Write a protein that binds this ligand. Structure first.
Ligand SMILES: [Zn+2]
Length: 791
């Protein structure tokens, strides 16, 4: 059921799927391919159920290839998309032969899939597959953009023939427009299970933010707005068991304390209601306001799943108890404002009890129930109904609601813009924003849309996994790397909250980090939240992510993915490739870990703030500088031993690995440092190396480069003396093989050449910091060649 997905991701190499598909949209190879297959599988499920002819047809189709029914359908679309996307300028379609080897699939199927892609019907048996895939292919157009565009592109294009065949499979197409809101997200799953069930016969497919697209079997019960409206009345009502639990003790306390007299007047109501001391007792003598809160004051602002349940499951909760004692309460403490006994009241303030009948009379009060309370059940309904007239409109559904006349309603909501009779919509959302959905949040949009059948599958667990960033482009495959990313697949997902009708998903930050969050999103806290972000993107098949404290923050469309925020930093800029983009943030992911170990708990806030600005500044010139941004300027302990040797040492290799592919400038820089780092251990065989014992000559040449006197020299004239000073100090300190010294010379030349190029751009003042950066980075590279498998 979900295992097909596992196999596919296991076969495609990490970088294979991370790659950008089309220049038109920010789509990942994996995102699109897996998605096409997902829909493909769901489609065949519908056919098997509805068409009995197609059911047997699909059955024989499986036997032809000796492939399990379900599995045969999925990989069909997945590969079809890949072979279609082989239109990338390379066309090296030989890549599929590797996939075929890991998939262990027959060539005949592929030969058919080739004619499914380019060609036409393999044969009439292969028709449902030809149809299913074509449908899914159309649904994931570069930018379908709108649900209506789907229908326009349907019929207009070759996809029309498939719709013609769909009708013959006793299956029709439909859609419902739905606007994104906080309330929609929570009950989204419930609706899918209740309204769009295979029981009624709906099989939901994908959503595009404008709404949802689904299927309708012939003679299926039509989509009815009645239940749509009936459901929220119960859901917009946060009637949890614990919501009802308080009043259980509230009014219990008011009455349980008088158990003495709440049983005695079962006989001789007069012996208790009357006293020899006078005539009668005060309500407060029998029910003190001290321990008793008035009924309507007890039920402050509740309606039915709370107040009618408070008039049912709370009138009869322990009312099996002192059914006799409970009576006096409603007979007397009917609370302030409404002393409306509205019953067989005799008007006697006290002797009424003797005149009335026995406990058979209780049932009559139970008849007065389901009256004023259920009024609130059908009261603010039309306030909400306006959404089902405007927001939840444009649908193949049927409106089952009254007209919106409600002659003279009350004012329209100040914020949600909805009339009443603010609004409860924002009120419910505000109670929710207290804890159920506390800010800030992580929102990931999907282009054009995302299969609902996959939206209920993905989850994640970063509790034990902590932060993990060790991946390779071609070594580890997508799945193995996804496993390291701590991603999970639960049909009953618990830590992911998807707005199924908005082609987007939100993740509450509370489950992601145990860190203390804030009321909003701040630049300081933004830093701490960033390392987890790229992982989320990768877990969601390389999809763009935005971090924000307001859900309705609409995200900002290059062919590449974009990790963005309320405010955008330069280092967060999207590079020419998704592979590179992720690696750039994976660099921060690694730096964060080290900083955590280095700075103290409180010191981290100020530490990270500085790292952020520095990384931003360096990346402005070249992204490669961004990758190496550790600091080496002003603001951090220059305690190299308490810094590099402490935690930066292991990830160094990975960081340098990234610096290798970010830019050609960085390619030259990385190679140069590494060449020198290899040469270093040759000369200084001994590991009695000190800080200055290895970098002195370098700094000597650097100071010389920057010495104002040498600056007036031409680019080549200056780099001449600069390197000449460096290598002079080297041979002053240690003799150099005339053979070996040449390697370093050539490398240093490019180093000083780029130094002139980072001086051509930007300012020489800033360039100095980058020199110090690379300086300490050279010692690091020397420690890395000295690593030699050191745990
Ligand atoms: Zn409102």
């Amino acid at each position: 059921l979900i295992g097909l997905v596992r196999t596919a991701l296991d076969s495609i190499t990490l970088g294979q799927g991370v790659n950008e598909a089309k220049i038109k949209s920010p789509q990942s190879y994996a995102f699109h391919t897996i998605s096409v297959g997902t829909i493909s599988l769901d489609i065949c499920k519908a056919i098997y159920s509805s068409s009995e002819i197609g059911r047997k047809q699909l059955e024989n189709l499986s036997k032809k290839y000796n492939m399990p029914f379900e599995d045969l359908w999925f990989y069909g679309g997945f590969l079809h998309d890949w072979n279609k996307l082989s239109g990338k300028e390379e066309n090296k379609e030989e890549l599929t032969k590797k996939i075929i080897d890991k998939l262990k699939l027959p060539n005949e199927f592929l030969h058919g899939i080739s004619t499914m892609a380019e060609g036409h019907l393999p044969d009439n048996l292969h028709l449902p597959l030809w149809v299913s895939i074509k449908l899914a292919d159309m649904l994931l157009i570069s930018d379908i953009g709108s649900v209506r565009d789907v229908f326009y592109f349907a019929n207009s294009d070759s996809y029309r023939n498939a719709i013609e065949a769909l009708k013959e499979y006793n299956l029709e197409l439909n859609y419902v427009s739905s606007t994104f809101r906080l309330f929609t997200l929570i009950a989204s799953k419930e609706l899918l299970n209740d309204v769009f069930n295979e029981k009624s016969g709906y099989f939901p497919l994908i959503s595009y933010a404008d709404g949802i697209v689904f299927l309708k079997r012939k003679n299926s019960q039509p989509v009815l707005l009645s239940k749509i409206v009936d459901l929220l009345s119960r859901q917009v009502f946060s009637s949890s068991s614990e919501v009802i639990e308080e009043k259980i003790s509230d009014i219990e306390k008011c009455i349980k304390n008088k158990e003495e007299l709440f049983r005695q007047m079962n006989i001789d109501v007069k012996s208790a209601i009357y006293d020899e001391e006078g005539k009668v007792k005060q309500i407060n003598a029998f029910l003190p306001t001290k321990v008793c809160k008035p009924f309507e004051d007890v039920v402050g602002n509740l309606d039915n799943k709370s107040k009618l349940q408070v008039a049912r499951e709370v009138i009869e909760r322990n009312r099996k108890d002192i059914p006799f004692g409970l009576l006096i309460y409603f007979v007397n403490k009917f609370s302030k404002n409404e002393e409306d006994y509205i019953r067989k009241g005799l008007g006697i303030n006290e002797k009424s009890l003797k005149y009335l009948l026995n406990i058979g009379d209780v049932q009559k009060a139970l008849d007065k129930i389901l009256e004023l309370l259920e009024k609130r059940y059908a009261e603010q309904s039309s306030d909400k109904t306006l959404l089902y007239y405007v927001k939840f409109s444009s649908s193949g559904n049927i409106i089952d609601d009254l007209p919106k006349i409600t002659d003279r309603p009350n004012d329209y909501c100040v914020v949600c813009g909805m009339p009443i009779y603010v609004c409860p919509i924002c009120i419910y959302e505000a109670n929710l924003m207290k804890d159920r959905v506390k800010p800030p949040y992580f929102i990931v949009t999907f282009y054009p849309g995302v299969p609902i059948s996959l939206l209920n599958i993905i989850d994640f667990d970063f509790s034990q996994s902590s932060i993990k960033y060790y991946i390779d482009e071609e070594k580890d495959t997508y799945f193995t790397a996804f496993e390291k990313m701590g991603g999970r697949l639960e049909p009953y997902v618990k830590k992911v909250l998807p707005a199924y009708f908005s082609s987007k998903v939100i993740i509450k930050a509370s489950e992601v980090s145990n860190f203390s969050l804030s009321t909003r999103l701040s630049k300081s806290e933004l830093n701490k939240l960033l390392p987890y972000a790229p992982m989320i993107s990768m877990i969601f098949l390389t999809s763009p992510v935005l971090i924000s404290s307001n859900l309705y923050e609409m995200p900002i469309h290059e062919r590449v993915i974009s990790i963005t925020s309320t405010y955008n930093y330069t280092f967060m800029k999207s590079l020419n490739s998704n592979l590179l983009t992720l690696y750039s943030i994976f660099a921060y992911s690694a730096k964060y870990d080290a900083m955590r170990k280095i700075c103290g708990r409180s010191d981290l806030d100020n530490c990270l703030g500085y790292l952020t600005e520095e990384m931003d500044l360096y990346s402005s010139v070249d992204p490669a500088l961004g990758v190496l941004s550790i600091g080496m300027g002003v603001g951090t302990p220059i305690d190299t031993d308490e810094k590099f040797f402490s935690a930066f040492l292991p990830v160094s290799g990975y960081l340098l690995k990234v610096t290798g592919k970010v830019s050609k400038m960085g390619e030259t820089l990385k190679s140069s440092i590494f060449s020198i780092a290899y040469a270093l251990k040759d000369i200084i065989k001994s590991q009695k190396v000190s800080k200055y014992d290895v970098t002195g000559f370098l700094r000597d040449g650097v100071d010389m480069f920057f010495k104002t006197t040498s600056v007036i020299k031409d680019k080549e004239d200056r780099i001449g003396i600069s390197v000449n000073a460096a290598i002079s100090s080297l041979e002053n300190k240690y003799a150099l093989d005339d053979q070996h010294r040449a390697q370093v010379y050539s490398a240093l030349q490019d180093i000083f050449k780029t130094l002139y190029s980072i001086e051509e751009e930007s300012d020489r003042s800033l360039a100095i910091s980058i020199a110090n950066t690379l300086s300490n980075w050279l010692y690091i590279a020397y420690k890395l060649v000295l690593q030699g498998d050191k745990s």
